[PDB]
Every structure is written in structure tokens, then in C-alpha cells.
Write a protein that binds this ligand. Structure first.
Ligand SMILES: Cc1cc2nc3c(=O)[nH]c(=O)nc-3n(C[C@H](O)[C@H](O)[C@H](O)COP(=O)(O)O)c2cc1C
Ligand SMILES: Cc1cc2nc3c(=O)[nH]c(=O)nc-3n(C[C@H](O)[C@H](O)[C@H](O)COP(=O)(O)O)c2cc1C
Ligand SMILES: O=C(O)c1cccnc1
Ligand SMILES: O=C(O)c1cccnc1
Lengths: 216, 216
């Protein structure tokens, strides 16, 4: 059951570089990235999946400075996902989303379709025009993607670790993300843990629900 | 197989008000909230789980203005989770986290424990002192929790819908969150869809991977 998975998964601190995702698992992790929900189906994200040694090493350059303890996880894991958010929400993206909803069969009439576009545009506008927080808003959708992904990959039997400990300016410049409209937020190596993963035998710790949760 | 679950789950547009979570499901969804990961195990969140008619109706007041289309979901569903983030990261919370890590058996020595505290404080300080983005940082952790939650409850066989379409200032004041150090971010009704959920028979739509995903 999924609760066992939630209780047994852990942040892997070191990966076995000789254990690769199966071809089928490599497909499945891309499916998880794609099929996450997002506010208005805005999907304001891009993913880089590095599985070559070259491409992981490029991503690993971002694990410099204070963040070297993360470098080896990025090099040793089978696949390394970089989760990136759009830096602004443009009308071309909003059109592409609704056209795709349309191509996929979600609208019965042109009017249903126009209403969807109008509603997405309205709610998007509150972030990009009124509140000026559309960067933050899109980044949140991407973290939601991450949350989905980590539970997903745990349920496939894979090890993983989310990493904020890396230099986004480096990683952005390494892949040309600013000029393309994106910024890197979280890196998630996926694979199988090695013997150096001290975190695999430690008990899980969370605050008690009497602190964090209220029922009404 | 979690990939099926990811491909079959949907944002429920209408719930059967007669169909309740089993008492066991009610406990399991609290377990998912608690055991989400977060950066440094900071767990910078609070949840309100409404199960009673009174409690749900309090939450549903936030579905005012042009967010009325969400009101029914909040009233008809069995359980309604309000995801809240801390509004600031204080040293009392950081201490509580590490003491809990300690009580749960994650430190071999007092020195291991002090090192953990030091590392959490260092990385937290980067957000609350250098970048002044600690609110955003914590809110991200909360969205991650959401993403975990949505996949988790779908794997328990429950229907749900994440909701940003509600008025957070109302919901905050309804539960006294500002003064307690919290702000509401996302609301997630959980239960079982009614036959009025038009979204249960619509195909899922996502942008294709040739736009959103790059392999290297
Ligand atoms: C957004 C995010 C960023 C994280 N960044 C790092 C990281 O840079 N390095 C690391 O070793 N762990 C990192 N973690 C792992 C957390 O410390 C871990 O999730 C938390 O301590 C709970 O343990 P668990 O993930 O084993 O349940 C991160 C977690 C998340 C959610
Ligand atoms: C953070 C968040 C906010 C959302 N807010 C609402 C909302 O207010 N009302 C609603 O009906 N759907 C809401 N949705 C549902 C999305 O529109 C839906 O996820 C998206 O269209 C993808 O369809 P799916 O969830 O069925 O896969 C929200 C989704 C997320 C992730
Ligand atoms: O996804 C949606 O339909 C949505 C998101 C936020 C607010 N209103 C609608
Ligand atoms: O969770 C961690 O251990 C973590 C998070 C950010 C940066 N370094 C470590």
C-alpha cells in the first residue's frame, strides 16, 4: 500500500552508479513528470532528464561551493531530473495549453473552449498583473510536481533525493535556461542507494500531529 | 502500479455528500500529510482537516466572490484539508524539529545533533537573512506536500481536487491563522465523485514531452 511506501521511502545520500533504471522505469519517470496536475493545467515547467555521464556531470557542476556534498549524488545516480519553472507566464503558453486541451477532446463546443481560455487568462492575470507573483506561483506548481514525483518513484521501487543544495545560476547558465524562459528549482537524482547511504537505516522523523494538524 | 494511478486520477468537480472516508482512510490521509518530505525536514506547515458540517462550512466561506464555483466541492466532500505554511521560520520551530529528530533516534551523539542543528540553521538563514524569501521557500515545501498528498489519496482509491480558487484572507481570519503564524495556501477536498463530476469522463490533457522535457 501507498502508506508503507510513504513510511519506507527516504532521501538517499549516495547512489550506486552501476545500477541503472530499466528502459521501462526510464519511461515511467517521464510519465510522472508529464502527468502531474498544476493550477489551471498551466504546466509551467520544463524538465531536464540526464542519464548520460556527460549530462549528469554538467548538472553536477551546479553542486559547487557549499554544496559539494550533493555533487556525488548527481554523478552516481542513474537518472537526474532537473525541475525548472517558467520565469514568466506568456500568452503563447496559455494558448498552447488550451489548444492541447482542445486536441485531447476536452471541449464539447468552441464556446466551452473559449470559456476555459477566458478563465485561465483571468486567473493567470491575477498573478502576472495584479499581484506580480507569477514567478512564485509557477514555482509552486513545480514543487507540487516534485512532491508527486518523489512519491511516484518510491512506489516504482526507486531511490531518490530532492536537492535544493545547488547553485541555480550555474545550472541555468550551463543549459541556457534564462534565454529559453526557465529557471531551475530542484534536482532529483533517481536510482538505487549504495552502501554509503547512511540515511537508509535511520528511522524517519516527523513532528507529531498534535502540533501540525487541527481537526474541525 | 502507481503509473496507472497517476494516469487515472482527476480533479473531481463534484462530490457525493453521502460517501464518507472510512475511519481507516481518515487516519491514512493524516499520515500522508505528516510524512511528506521537506527541505531540511523543516516541515514548515499546518493542516486543518474538516470532517463535520460546521467545520466544512467554515472553510467553504472562503469560496466567495468569483470563487463560488468551488464552494460545493468544499461542502459535499467527506474531508477537507487546508494546507497552510508558516509565515516566518523561527528558531523555536527549528529546535523542535531537531529535538524530534533526536527523540526518533536519528543522532548517535550530542555532536551529530548539534551538527544537524547547525546545518539546518545555516541553510535556513540563507532564506530568512540573505535572500529574505523564507515565506516563499516554506510555501514551496507545502506545495510539495500537496503533490505527495494528491497522488497518495488517489492510490488509496479516493477522489480529490486541489483548489487555489478561494480567498485566503477570509480563510486565514476564519481560523485565526495570521496571529498563530500561518497562512493558507491550498484546499483539498477528499471523498468520492458524484455522477455530476463531468471531469471524471473527460480525457486527461497534457503538453507533449517534445515541448516540456529534454534528455541529455
Ligand atoms: C525541496 C527539498 C530539498 C532538499 N534538499 C536536499 C539537499 O540538498 N540535500 C539533501 O541531502 N537532502 C535534501 N532534502 C532531503 C530532506 O532533508 C529530507 O526530505 C528530510 O530530511 C526528510 O527525510 P526523508 O526525505 O528521508 O523523509 C531536501 C528535501 C526537499 C523536499
Ligand atoms: C494548486 C492547484 C490549484 C487548482 N485549483 C483549482 C480550483 O480552484 N478549482 C478546480 O476545479 N480545479 C483546480 N485545480 C485543478 C486543475 O485545474 C487540474 O489539476 C488540471 O486541469 C489538471 O487536470 P487533473 O488534475 O484532472 O489532472 C487546481 C490544481 C492545482 C494543482
Ligand atoms: O485549475 C483551475 O481550474 C483553477 C485554478 C485556480 C482557480 N480557479 C480555477
Ligand atoms: O535537506 C537538506 O538536507 C538540505 C536542504 C538544502 C540544502 N542542503 C541540505
Amino acid at each position: 500500500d501507498i502508506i508503507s511506501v510513504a513510511l519506507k521511502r527516504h532521501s538517499t545520500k549516495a547512489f550506486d552508479a552501476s545500477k541503472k533504471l530499466t528502459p521501462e522505469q526510464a519511461e515511467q519517470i517521464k510519465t510522472l513528470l508529464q502527468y502531474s496536475p498544476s493550477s489551471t493545467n498551466s504546466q509551467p515547467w520544463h524538465f531536464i532528464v540526464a542519464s548520460t555521464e556527460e549530462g549528469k556531470a554538467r548538472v553536477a557542476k551546479s553542486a559547487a561551493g557549499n554544496y559539494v556534498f550533493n555533487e556525488r549524488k548527481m554523478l552516481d545516480a542513474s537518472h537526474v531530473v532537473v525541475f525548472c519553472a517558467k520565469t514568466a507566464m506568456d500568452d503563447v503558453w496559455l494558448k498552447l495549453v488550451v489548444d492541447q486541451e482542445d486536441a485531447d477532446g476536452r471541449f464539447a463546443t468552441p464556446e466551452a473552449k473559449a470559456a476555459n481560455d477566458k478563465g485561465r487568462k483571468f486567473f493567470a492575470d491575477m498573478h502576472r498583473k495584479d499581484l506580480h507573483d507569477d514567478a512564485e506561483w509557477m514555482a509552486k506548481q513545480v514543487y507540487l510536481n516534485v512532491g508527486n514525483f518523489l512519491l511516484g518513484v518510491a512506489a516504482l521501487g526507486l531511490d531518490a533525493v530532492p536537492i535544493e543544495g545547488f547553485d541555480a545560476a550555474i545550472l541555468d547558465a550551463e543549459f541556457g535556461l534564462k534565454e529559453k524562459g526557465y529557471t531551475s528549482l530542484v534536482v532529483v537524482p533517481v536510482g538505487h542507494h549504495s552502501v554509503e547511504d547512511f540515511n537508509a537505516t535511520l528511522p524517519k522523523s516527523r513532528l507529531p500531529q498534535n502540533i501540525t494538524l487541527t481537526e474541525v
